[PDB]
Design a protein around this nucleic acid. Structure first.
Ligand SMILES: [Mg+2]
Length: 122
RNA sequence: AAGGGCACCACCAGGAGUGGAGCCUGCGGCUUAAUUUGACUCAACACGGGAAACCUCACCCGGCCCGGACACGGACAGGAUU
């Protein structure tokens, strides 16, 4: 399970240092409605059902992959949406709830989401 | 006070004048919301290279903008904000 979660860690890291990936609900909607977006990542600890039924029901009608992570806070720490000093707060913000990767930057570690799509089609 | 010398920003011998008139322009005063301000014997007053319609622009009457770095807290991708 390390070789998939750390894998999309590296994927979103190279995506955000190479370009801008959409962070937050409005940019996520406006980025995946356009027909270039790669997989979405969204949290599991959401407290309201219309938010989650919106995001899954609106990504499933597209042809885009989905990976679900348990907490939004630690995800937001992962997605670079913070002011991380190496001796202070890891995540001083309420973390992000859903992102979408517009571009990977390069094809170094695309095999992880390739086999992710394989087991999704399994 | 005396004794030497000197200068048309002194005089003499004169020339052209200015002071008088209309106008231009600079100062004071008066008036004004404001009539921005400096300079007042030579050594201020067509001077600030100052002939301002706007800008200049300081002054008056109104109305936008931040072009308030940075540091520390706060709030923040369920949205700081434009
Ligand atoms: Mg004389």
């Amino acid at each position: 399970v390390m070789d998939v979660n750390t894998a999309l860690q590296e994927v979103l890291k190279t995506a955000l240092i190479h370009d801008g990936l959409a962070r937050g609900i409005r940019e996520a909607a406006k980025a995946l409605d356009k027909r270039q977006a790669h997989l979405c990542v969204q949290a599991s600890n959401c407290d309201e059902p219309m938010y989650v039924k919106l995001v899954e029901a609106l990504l499933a009608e597209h042809q885009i992959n989905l990976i679900k992570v348990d907490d939004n806070k630690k995800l937001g720490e992962w997605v670079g949406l913070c002011k991380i000093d190496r001796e202070g707060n890891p995540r001083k913000v309420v973390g992000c709830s859903c992102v979408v990767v517009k571009d990977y930057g390069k094809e170094s570690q695309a095999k992880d989401v390739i086999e992710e799509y394989f087991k999704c089609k399994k």
